[PDB]
């Protein structure tokens, strides 16, 4: 009931649009986090550690869209800075668990003190759509596919990010 | 008139959603193109060469969301396969121009003969939204930001991709 | 799992938005059809008769969002003009069926010769959203609810309207 | 730059969709308000009176999508019930102003005690889209046209309706 043509059209559409979105976010994300000598995957774990305090590196991998192997290496380089701590559970656990540090939290805070959304590209690009809608675009069409792929357990990172950001101290002036 | 809080919420929203979209497309794109020993940026140039027959590597970079330096190296490794050809313009041109080859076109065709949209993730993930809308999601909210960033000249790749795909031979059976 | 508050908010939202949409379409629809001394429900039947050539007044009621009683009276006043014809089926049929006339078709055509979308309000109001999307808004969110209510058989009027309009003679110049 | 064909397609699309939306809301709105012997335009004024305490009948007409003449007659039949009160301003005012009564407020409250969103059609029809989006559809595409027509001053009724509904007593149990 579905044409291969309309499929290829869809795929070429979203593949070009997704690469434009990640590559532009990469540039603004890296410039924001490079003054602390970190990469986007390491920072992802540092924010995942704030939003979920104690999580297996396997969960860090799922929420981080990383390989388990990849998340291990960056988490270990993060402990070796003191920005993160490691824990092992009782009984019999193969899993290795992860928490943040006061040095790690403070690094996130001084990054928050330097958050200029003006410099970020997608922010300015979404200012037109915000003025017509009254609020930032909620891109529900995209959000539906991602849940329908990664799972509802993956999507819960948005909820906990929002609620923790809602109860947040000293973002900037005021 | 805009809260820094609603900005951070937006940024964390789209940054998590964009990374999920590119990483899942990467895996399905690479598996599709790896039987020919190519990467996603090289294939991008091979499709850009079909949709725009003669283009500067600088335009290949803009449409490809690549650095000019990066597009040069992959285009040169593509000529050294015979999948692509190079040209230089008259008068005085610093620019180096690019065309496809019959070997390069045929490689795209045998990849088209192996296009199973079932294996691609975002395809199956968009089947729910297609049934409710009658047709594949057009994600216009995203498409507006990207144009408002990369430029209308960048966006013309979708038009020429659609029209060339509409006039396409032997995708699969029928 | 659902708040009565978010329900009331939704209802007050769509009830105010729907009344604004119908009342503004009423004014532009009536001004367009009043030079022929017809109402919006009568014209609806005249277009339903073009898109579905022979239909029961009960189907005219479903597609017309009219009562069966209401559709009868207007269809009868339409036959008594010669803009429409009536038929009765074989065997044993309670139903009364309906077709268009050459006088009725020509009335639709001279209305088509007078279609100025500039005067229609929603047209100009949708010009902003069309420029950002490249094409007229497809309001899929609304279209999903209506199908989920009236039925898929009701929705088929859009398909046959589009395809018949695609194969249409002398709309205006060219 | 715009086809008359794509215009007619758009108009037939939204005209059929808007009539389906108003007619279905009419039936559920009237059944909800008929036990108090009121019509949808009268109830509209009674809610406009709650959301804007003292407003000219001309503003009631704009927010109510009514004629000034029509809003006068229903407001006068509302005062003659004691559900509403009238006032005249100082200096020199042609305008006649309007406020609610305790009898009028209590009528709205006992209607709120009888609000079953299950019986309302569009509510159940929007339950599918809510489950995929996590929240009720916000139909921003429609909301943009209406603002681009009726004006931003008209749209402020949604803001004051939301904020007043957010600070509301005894909707139902809890």
Swiss-Prot record, chains A, B, C, D:
One of its GO terms (biological process) is response to stress. Gene3D superfamilies: Winged helix-like DNA-binding domain superfamily/Winged helix DNA-binding domain. The keyword Ribonucleoprotein does not apply. One of its GO terms (molecular function) is DNA-binding transcription factor activity. Residues 7-151 form the HTH marR-type domain. Residues 57-80 bind DNA. Pfam families: MarR. Keywords: DNA-binding, Repressor, Sporulation, Transcription, Transcription regulation. InterPro entries: HTH_MarR-typ, HTH_tscrpt_reg_Hpr, MarR/SlyA-like, Tscrpt_reg_MarR-type_CS, WH-like_DNA-bd_sf, WH_DNA-bd_sf. The keyword Transcription regulation applies. Homodimer. Negative regulator of protease production and sporulation. NCBIfam families: PRK13777.1. This is HTH-type transcriptional regulator Hpr. It comes from Geobacillus kaustophilus (strain HTA426).
């Amino acid at each position: 009931h579905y044409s291969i043509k309309e499929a290829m059209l869809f795929s070429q559409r979203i593949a070009q649009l997704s690469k434009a979105l990640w590559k532009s976010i990469e540039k603004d994300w890296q410039r924001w986090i490079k003054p602390f000598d970190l990469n986007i995957n390491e920072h992802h774990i540092l924010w995942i550690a704030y939003h979920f305090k104690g999580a297996s590196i396997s969960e860090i991998a799922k929420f981080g869209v990383m390989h388990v192997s990849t998340a291990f290496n960056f988490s270990k380089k993060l402990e070796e800075k003191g920005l993160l701590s490691f824990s092992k559970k009782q009984d019999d656990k193969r899993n290795t668990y992860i928490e943040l540090t006061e040095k790690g939290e403070e690094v996130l805070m001084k990054l928050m003190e330097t958050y200029d959304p003006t410099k970020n590209a997608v922010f300015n690009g979404a200012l037109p759509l915000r003025e017509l809608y009254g609020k930032f675009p909620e891109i529900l069409e995209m959000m539906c596919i991602v849940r329908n792929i990664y799972g509802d357990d993956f999507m819960e990172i948005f909820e906990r990010a929002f609620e923790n950001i809602k109860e947040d101290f000293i973002e900037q002036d005021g």
